[model samples]
Target: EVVTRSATGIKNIVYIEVNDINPLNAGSYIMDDAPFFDYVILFAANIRGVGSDATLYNNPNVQYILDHKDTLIKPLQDKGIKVLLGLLGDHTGLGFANMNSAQTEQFATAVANAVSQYGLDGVDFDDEWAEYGRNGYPSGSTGSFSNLITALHNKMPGKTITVFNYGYTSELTGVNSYIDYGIYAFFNSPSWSTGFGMPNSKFAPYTINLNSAPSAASAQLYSGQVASKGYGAIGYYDLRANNIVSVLNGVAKGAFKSTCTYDGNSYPKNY
Candidate 1:
């Protein structure tokens, strides 16, 4: 199925998501703190501008990204685990004070370059629940996202570009050839009107299922119970039991091969 391959094809490995909002808690979840997965995403908040230095970004999410630097990079490198930074979208719709088009590109390219300079990895976009009204997705912006990714790809082909899609539309529309990996945001959304796992549209009809909350055990148990957590349970959310260490270790594996199962499906392929 993966016909159109790029020089930077999708790497089949487990990935850990580090929001970096809390560095103290990051170790239990990241590569340096722990070596469970092959790659980790260094997530930053949506900063919208470049010129407005004084009142640039006031959001805590933005501050989190701005604050944590060495804390994030040092450990990732120490473990030899690949690193990727996240360029998030307008989560609250309040706008990150400076997120214009040119600025977006500039910041993205800068992030890419910075990652490379750090000997880290690539960057990704995680615009959680981005609305349609806020000029976030202007005409062709969907394609533009791909284009920006292509631009980043050109600059740092050695890195990866992962797109985290929250809704059904993103799953179908954004999973294009340019995307190195698509982290389907198939969790936490409301159940489908008809059923939990049923398709939302004609194309996705039963093709993907995002309902996996019932089966989760501790992280220590994951090594022994790799086949427990079910499909669609691999990506995010606290599907595993509340054991943080287990969840971290499970994420390190990137297989969703936890001690859970769903609908008789096999272990999840990518996390």
Candidate 2:
């Protein structure tokens, strides 16, 4: 639904790429049965170009989401799960870095518009390009990331904004001031609460192992870690993989400590 913030306490999130679904049908997708996550982030809407004209453009994948949002997206929201749009930096920071004041504002405005147009609950920033040494936008600017987030916050007040802390070594990455949560993409790794330094309130450790379904053992381990650490959330990169619901159930049980529930559905093992 229109999730304005992370759940009051611990949260669970799932990511789904719209294009991955079978275009011919909607019920074939696993998300229909997977209701354990507190939030479901539609994989991405890419940022195109650089400078003052930088803007967001949806690809075929994003189009699929927008096209079927009524049938596909609304149901999840109706179940009380906040679905957000992931805004990727095109993996180059070309559209984000090297911007003048006007360009920065333009980019933010464009993002805000998309959030409104798509009927999304919020935005997630997968800033993969920051470590590539290309984030030089705003030319000698400080808090460029923060400023962009602030602009977004102003545009969509109370809406959640997330930062993918997958690539960076530092915790904040210059945008924490305006973000609602920080997700650690633990792609196939067994790191526990790897925030590097971010606070527990904002940390949400996630995993990405598309090669196969996450083992029940692995799910239990990660979920337990999230719980013991008192972190706010945990997420998986996709919903298409086999046994995703089982993995999420493990997260729900561990993260919420015997009280995890989503959309009135209780997890398999609460304690």
Candidate 3:
């Protein structure tokens, strides 16, 4: 029921803000810049919770993707780019850390249902902003995080699952068997990802920040490291139409050995 992800080799995962620009900017940047990137995660969909309940809330931007999957999602998948729904905690007491078994099943099923319904590639767990114990819910637990990850994994066979290493991600270090990528949130070494016992082929050690962007020298060094060190992927944060060309051109070279081509229009040219 999931769309098969044809994108392979070392990944260049880019995060796009749907609220700021058209989701089509992702495809446009790929066409206009280099196609070295692998995945495009819509900035996010939220997990809002109350008491013992939680649900996926697609904001206006996220709903736009669902509304125009034919143009917004399919065309990108057609280019071998996996489109994943980014999940964030929306200041709720209900999050991976505190979800009871029943709640876990409900939330995971809800997420899986959305993925299937929207024809997406997978789900990404960005476990931040959820004040776990704020509303008399539970707090951190290894099993809590493990249970949620495994639940989603089993529910969505063959779909990629990634986790951003932040907040309660301390629980994620030992749970990589069912996870595709353990993305360290910022510029940090194996301190935690070393805790993240996944293969070198599955951990993205160097995460680039798009708000600051990257210099060509730094990007090439990072890309070369990713290629030679054999890190499975590269994570680019907060990318948009205006920044894509300036930002993408640098990384698309070196280890990727890409042409940095630009055939399509830039952002503001949305579907």
Give all TM-scores, in the order shown: 0.53, 0.76, 0.87
Q: Which stretches of candidate 1 lie over 4 Å from their true place?
A: 1-34, 47-68, 91-107, 117-119, 129-142, 167-177, 188-233, 237-243, 247-271
Candidate 1 weakest ten by summed lDDT: 202-211
Q: For candidate 2, lDDT tens digit of each residue in 108-227?
A: 998888778868789887865432335544333343555677788889986788777653335345556567777777664445554535677677765645335676557767767766
TM-score of 3: 0.87
RMSD in Å for all candidates: 10.0, 6.9, 4.0
lDDT of 1 by residue, 1-271 (tens): 4567533311212333333223222233333333433445555434343233111222564334334545545664575655666555543332222234564466556766566655666665665544423443232223344445556667777776665554322432432545555554443222222221222221110111112432223332432222222222223432221224434444334333332212221222121
TM-score order of candidates, top first: 3, 2, 1
> Residue 17 in model 1: shift from native, Å?
8.6
Error of 2 at 99 (Å): 2.6
Model 3 C-alpha lDDT per residue in residues 1-271, reported as the tens digit of each score: 4589754577777777778866666665553344556888887998888556778889987898788899778888887788999999888766777787887888898999999999999988888888777777776652667888888889897898888777676676666788888776774122224335677678777777766776766777667767787778778777666644654666667557664655566657343
At residue 146, give the lDDT of candidate 2: 59
**What value does the lDDT take at residue 129 in candidate 3?**
85
What is the overall TM-score of model 1 with all chains considered together? 0.53
Taken over the whole model, the C-alpha lDDT of each candidate is 0.40, 0.61, 0.74
User: Model 2, residue 39: what's the lDDT?
Assistant: 71
Ten-residue stretch with the least lDDT total in model 2 = 262-271
Q: Which of the numbered candidates is closest to the native, going by highest lDDT?
A: 3
